Design a protein around this ligand. Structure first.
Ligand SMILES: C/C=C(\C)CC/C=C(\C)CCC=C(C)C
Lengths: 1033, 262
């Protein structure tokens, strides 16, 4: 091979100029999806990769000094495409503003534009435009090309828009989207659903663009893009939770390679990377390409072209005939070059060569997909991968797949080593196992495996009287005045400061949305307007909700915040955790728990998190300061000084709810004066806002603020009844509930928000704070307003546990709040004995957490088995992998499962879904939902476990008729009676008590009778001679 | 250590340009509306109105040794690129008119004088305005050549090189093509009568000479990016300029726009 490098690059120049650059729009710079046909469609995702292909060849031509002007042509072909997307995006700036405030499928940026004008082409009804992969890839590649030297952003006005694009990407962790495949799921219902590729691309875009000067080398402090760490962190928490699954519907997707490999490399954990790579390699790799996802019917022979949506039963016909996309051989080829594995590069190169097509001039054509013909669909299903597939794009037809053609150039240039992996990755999205010291990218100074992070903990007391009085107990603290030039802020003041970031009155952009700054954001040190400002964590705010006033929860909130920072802080400096102590925390018995935590911080360790207690001036000297320069570039040097933290210079309710609510007379206003309890006040003021209008005048003042005064004042005493009524009758809603729910369902857990026996609303998909506020108060609970406050109490509590003890809710697929609050309220009855038991609204929020933790334990110790089946049954807790065993049951009952009038048939259940699928796990509880007794639920859940035990270890037996488990529960029931009647002749008839109290495993346990019940009916059927162990007789 | 006094006084000029010109630049297109009443961007006015930004950017680039005065130099330079590119898209969206005007030098096939400052589209129709202004495309072509020679990378693709090359043939016949001219009213009568104005003939001659063997990709360009200009049309414009001057046309004894030619 004596070929000069000019001739090697000229080889790709012809392909680039004739196959993708020939079609670049002279006006917009975009690349049309359909090269032949006159279609105006230009997809941002496809156009972005086309820009990379010209950019990749420009990087190759950067090694030729006599480039004959080809480096400039290819560098500025990428710039022309990159700026065209910006032109299209900025023409939709009114949509960027809307998507910032309320991310929705109908308020999002368009992902398809007219290639010749940049106008809007398809509406939200015709096309699913919510594709975060497009915006994230634009931000990612924008960083890549600017870092390589391509000048795309021309002025700060564009910088403001890119900052607003970042804001649209911050919230994506809670925004279901249609994904790269503009489809959402296999079912094609038009339903947005959270994709690992989209959220991972957002994570990749945020990491690359954080602190990135959009001007390149010709840049100053007023072009750097600021990224909220915590929305990035919650984007990564979503990615780590969703993975190795693409989404709820998809166990794997070919879109994962663009996410976990080039160009994003969004996975920083090598275990998961491997897990997620194999499921793509195993369940989607094929001879002709990669299948986008299992049961993908896009452009298949069994698809109706006219219909835009698939039937619920149409996904079954799509198994084994999924279109195979050759583009992912290239993605694996790029992955091989990046990761230093040459066998991977060669292996996927040997697979592309058969699937590659060529033009009349011999230029390679990468087909979009390879589909099995209609004549060969049924042979393919029986034996997959054995029948020939036809190319979607062949060349010589005029139809070219520009995304594939562009990605061909990138992979081949890497394979022939004409461009280095670092050339197309100037900002390092791929980092080798030398994973240290990358900001925002999990690679702190310690590296990828050690996380002994030291958090700088500043002890701040609200007043000197607290300062000296804590000092008398051995704890050194500083009041804000003691730390004087420094300013300690509530996180809200940081949000108010951040409201000016990204404003463009010319584009109508309003800045960063008013969203609370979490722990990692407040862990940073900010310098605003020449004042160094440190914001204490939101956990110390006494406005969002009232469990911050409970000292034990605050102690646990302080602990878990430090563990949260220990786990998710990955910047160069050491995080700053300002601890705020108020006089309410010291007064009363709350000193003893607070002092031990403060002593532990002084000792240097708390919750296993290494901390450093020192003066604020010490923990601020050499740390990196986030310069909020946008607050000065607008010349707002006289902006109002944001309000820094200012130093400060007993019986059960004698009034029953039904006693006076039933009372028709209005004299209860005098009864308000007659009674002396706070709860009686906290109820009397509530009716006065409903009976006598919202803002009626009372002795103290208006009704609206008088209840607010009581709610504030009741918390000071720690009279929890009044603080629960106070927050419930004001429709109080902390900012954490809505993200807490989103955390629940990204773990595979549906959430229902409603009291027992009343209307319960299932939260299938992530929702905005606004609708959940409407959910938790207006529609869900109306019998008692305090139901919502107790409903919101657990949601934070489960939010506390789901992260610290995720195994604790294993099997509990549905976190049903009111069903859970039954478990605590029924436990209080159990613990209450034959005495008036405690009220769940009397317990301090700490006891609410502890009792919740008590009634969740993996196995309550030594309790009545009846009662255990009550605690596990009420929680709807199932064994690990229980939902899987129901398949093996359903796989071997032809007529299905009938329980409590709810039938689970073999078909179409088996044909519709997969046996790791989440949808089936929801289907069982819907079938299981009619069982009213939680204890009766467990014995059925016990039974479905044992019949699975019988079926697995005994594959010869198979059921003939419908498995009616109530009969099997009833059949195993009477055998317990006649056995126990023989023992002592218990006279209770149709009483589950004796049957429930007996342990499963024992001399005569439940599962023994349950086993006998199954076999009696299982032996009522024909046995199948099995060849795994041919019967010796 | 500190900024030079030239940089300090340019800040007052930066404020003057920003408060007067650069604050009206459309975020999307980079174009400049004539005024609040006339919300459209003229090709001739936008090119002329960007000279202060281009001069300021060149003035700031003379001392680009710090991050900030590199960046404001970059902003002013690329704001000029934004406008000249934005004006390129306006004309490149009318390539059918450029192709038709090359063969038939009619007013009905001329590049529009005014465009949508927000979308780079034609605000008015081919007959609702006096559109044939060969000194508006030439003021673009002349400065496009000059701004590329100064280092501003405006043309990005070889297709735009072909477009600018075809724009040369658009302004080649300025010596033999009557146009409305710099004042969009044609003859002195203002009756829709196009006339041979020396401003259009002069402007095309300078634009043709400016584009003569000019590499639109700058120094990092090749023969594919070179605009070829024929001196026959360049010196034919001279034969008209010498005959017309000191008159601006047969209908005007003089025009102050000839200051834009002499
Ligand atoms: C040749 C004999 C056999 C193949 C045994 C048939 C199996 C059964 C009658 C049920 C056995 C069940 C167990 C739980 C061991």
């Amino acid at each position: 091979d004596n070929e000069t490098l000019w001739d090697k690059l000229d080889h790709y120049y012809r392909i680039v100029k004739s196959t993708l650059l020939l079609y670049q729009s002279p006006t917009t710079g975009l690349f049309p999806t359909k090269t032949c046909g006159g279609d105006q469609k230009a997809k941002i995702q496809d156009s972005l990769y086309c820009a990379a292909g010209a950019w990749a060849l420009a990087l190759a031509y950067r090694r030729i000094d006599d480039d004959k002007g080809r480096t400039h042509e290819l560098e500025h072909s990428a710039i022309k495409c990159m700026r065209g997307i910006l032109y299209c995006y900025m023409r939709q700036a009114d949509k960027v503003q809307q998507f910032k405030q309320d991310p929705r499928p109908t308020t999002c940026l368009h992902s398809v534009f007219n290639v010749h004008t940049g106008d809007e082409l398809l509406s939200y009804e015709e096309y699913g435009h919510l594709q975060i992969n497009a915006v994230s890839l634009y931000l990612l590649y924008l960083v890549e090309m600017i870092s390589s030297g391509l000048q795309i952003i021309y002025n700060t006005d564009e910088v403001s828009f890119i900052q607003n694009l970042v804001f649209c990407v911050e919230r994506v962790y809670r925004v279901p989207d249609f994904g790269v495949w503009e489809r959402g799921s296999k079912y094609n219902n038009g339903s947005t659903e959270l994709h690992s590729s989209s959220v991972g691309l957002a994570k990749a875009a945020l990491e690359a663009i954080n602190g990135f000067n959009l001007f390149g080398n010709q840049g100053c402090s007023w072009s750097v893009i600021f990224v909220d760490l915590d929305a990035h962190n919650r984007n990564r928490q979503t990615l780590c939770s969703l993975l190795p699954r693409e989404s709820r519907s998809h166990n794997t997707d070919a879109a994962l390679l663009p996410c976990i490999s080039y160009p994003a490399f969004a996975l920083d954990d090598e275990v998961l990377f491997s897990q997620t790579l194999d499921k793509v390699v195993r369940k989607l790799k094929g001879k002709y390409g990669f299948k986008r996802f299992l049961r993908d019917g896009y452009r298949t022979s069994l698809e109706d072209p006219n219909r835009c949506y698939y039937k619920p039963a149409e996904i079954k016909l799509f198994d084994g005939i999924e279109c195979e996309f050759p583009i992912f051989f290239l993605y694996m080829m790029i992955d091989g070059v990046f990761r230093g594995n040459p066998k991977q590069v060669q292996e996927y190169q040997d697979l592309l060569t058969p699937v590659l097509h060529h033009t009349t001039e011999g230029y390679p054509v990468v087909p979009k997909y390879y589909y099995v013909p209609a004549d060969f669909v049924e042979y393919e299903k029986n034996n997959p991968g054995s029948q020939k597939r036809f190319p979607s794009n062949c060349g010589r037809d005029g139809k070219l797949f520009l995304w594939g053609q562009a990605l061909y150039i990138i992979a081949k240039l890497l394979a022939d080593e004409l461009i280095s992996p670092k050339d197309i990755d100037p900002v390092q999205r791929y980092v080798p196992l030398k994973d240290q010291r990358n900001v925002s990218m999990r690679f702190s100074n310690q590296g990828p495996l050690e996380n002994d992070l030291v958090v700088h903990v500043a002890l701040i007391a609200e007043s000197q009287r607290l300062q000296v009085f804590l000092n008398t107990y051995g704890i050194q603290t500083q009041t804000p005045q003691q730390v004087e030039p420094i300013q300690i802020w509530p996180q809200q003041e940081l949000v108010k400061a951040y409201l000016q970031l990204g404003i463009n009155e010319k584009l109508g952009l309003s800045g960063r949305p008013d969203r609370p700054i979490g722990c990692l954001g407040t862990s940073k040190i900010y310098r605003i307007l020449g004042k160094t400002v440190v914001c204490y964590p939101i956990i110390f705010d006494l406005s969002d909700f009232y469990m911050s006033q409970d000292v034990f929860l605050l102690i646990d909130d302080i602990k878990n915040a430090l563990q949260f920072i220990k786990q998710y802080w990955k910047m160069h400096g050491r995080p700053l955790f300002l601890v705020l102590i108020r006089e309410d925390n010291i007064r009363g018995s709350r000193f003893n728990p607070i002092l031990d935590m403060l002593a532990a911080l002084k000792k240097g360790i708390i919750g296993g998190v290494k901390v450093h207690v020192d003066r604020l001036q010490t923990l601020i000297s050499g740390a990196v300061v986030e310069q909020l320069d946008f607050l000065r570039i607008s010349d707002t040097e006289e902006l109002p000084e944001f309000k820094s933290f200012e130093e400060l210079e007993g019986q059960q309710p004698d009034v029953n709810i039904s006693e006076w609510k039933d009372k028709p007379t209005h004299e209860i206003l005098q009864k308000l004066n007659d009674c002396s309890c706070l709860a009686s006040q906290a109820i009397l003021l509530g009716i006065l806002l409903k009976r006598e209008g919202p803002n009626f005048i009372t002795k103290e003042g208006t009704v609206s603020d008088h209840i607010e005064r009581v709610y504030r004042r009741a918390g000071s005493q720690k009279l929890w009844l009044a603080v629960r009524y106070g927050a419930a009758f004001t429709q109080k809603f902390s900012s954490s509930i809505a993200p807490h729910i989103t955390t629940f369902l990204v773990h595979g857990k549906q959430v229902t928000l409603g009291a027992f026996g009343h209307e319960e609303e299932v939260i299938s998909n992530p929702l905005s704070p606004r609708v959940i506020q409407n959910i938790i108060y207006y529609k869900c609970n109306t019998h008692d307003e305090r139901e919502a406050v107790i409903q919101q109490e657990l949601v934070i509590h489960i939010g506390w546990i789901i992260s610290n003890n995720p195994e604790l809710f294993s099997g509990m697929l549905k976190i049903r709040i009111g069903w859970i609050i039954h478990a605590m309220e029924y436990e209080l009855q159990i613990r209450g004995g034959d005495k008036p038991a405690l009220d769940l609204y009397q317990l301090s929020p700490s006891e609410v957490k502890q009792l919740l933790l008590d009634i969740l334990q993996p196995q309550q110790n030594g309790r009545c088995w009846l009662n255990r089946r009550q605690i596990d049954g009420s929680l709807n807790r199932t064994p690990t992998g229980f939902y899987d065993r129901v398949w093996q049951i359903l796989e071997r009952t032809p007529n299905g499962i009938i329980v409590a009038g709810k039938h689970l048939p073999q078909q179409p259940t088996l044909s519709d879904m997969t046996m790791y699928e989440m949808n089936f796990s929801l289907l069982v509880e819907d079938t299981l939902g009619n069982i009213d007794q939680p204890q009766y639920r467990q014995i059925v859940v016990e039974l479905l476990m044992v019949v699975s035990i019988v079926l697995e270890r005994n594959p010869e037996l198979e059921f003939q008729d419908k498995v009616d488990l109530d009969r099997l529960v009833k059949e195993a029931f009477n055998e317990f009676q006649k056995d126990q009647s023989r023992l002592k002749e218990i006279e209770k008839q149709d009483d589950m008590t004796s049957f429930y109290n007996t342990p499963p495993l024992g001399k005569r346990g439940t599962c023994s009778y349950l086993t006998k019940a199954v076999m009696n009916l299982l032996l009522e059927g024909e046995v199948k001679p099995n060849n795994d162990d041919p019967c010796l007789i | 250590r500190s900024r030079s006094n030239s940089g300090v006084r340019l800040d007052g000029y930066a404020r003057l340009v920003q408060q007067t010109i650069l604050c009206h630049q459309n975020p999307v297109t980079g174009l400049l509306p004539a005024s609040y009443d006339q919300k459209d961007a003229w090709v001739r006015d936008n090119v002329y109105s960007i000279l202060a930004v281009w001069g300021l950017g060149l003035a700031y680039r003379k001392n680009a040794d710090r991050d900030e005065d590199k960046a404001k130099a970059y902003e002013l330079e690329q704001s000029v690129v934004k406008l000249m590119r934005g004006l390129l898209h306006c004309m490149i969206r009318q390539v059918d008119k450029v192709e038709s005007f090359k063969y038939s030098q009619s007013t009905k096939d001329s590049l529009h004088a005014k465009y949508n400052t927000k979308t780079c589209a034609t605000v008015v129709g081919d007959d609702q305005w006096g559109h044939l202004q060969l000194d508006a495309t030439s003021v673009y072509l002349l400065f496009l050549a000059q701004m590329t020679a100064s280092g501003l990378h405006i043309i990005h693709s070889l297709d735009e090189v072909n477009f600018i090359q075809n724009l040369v043939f658009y302004i080649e016949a300025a010596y033999k093509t009557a146009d409305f001219g710099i004042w969009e009213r044609g003859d002195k009568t203002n009756q829709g009568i196009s006339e041979l104005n020396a401003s259009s003939v002069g402007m095309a001659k300078a634009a043709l000479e400016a584009l003569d063997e000019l590499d639109l990709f700058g120094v990092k360009g090749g023969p594919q990016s070179v605009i070829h200009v024929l001196a026959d049309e360049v010196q034919h414009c001279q034969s008209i300029l010498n005959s017309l001057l000191p008159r601006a046309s047969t209908s005007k004894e003089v025009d102050a726009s000839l200051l834009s030619v002499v």
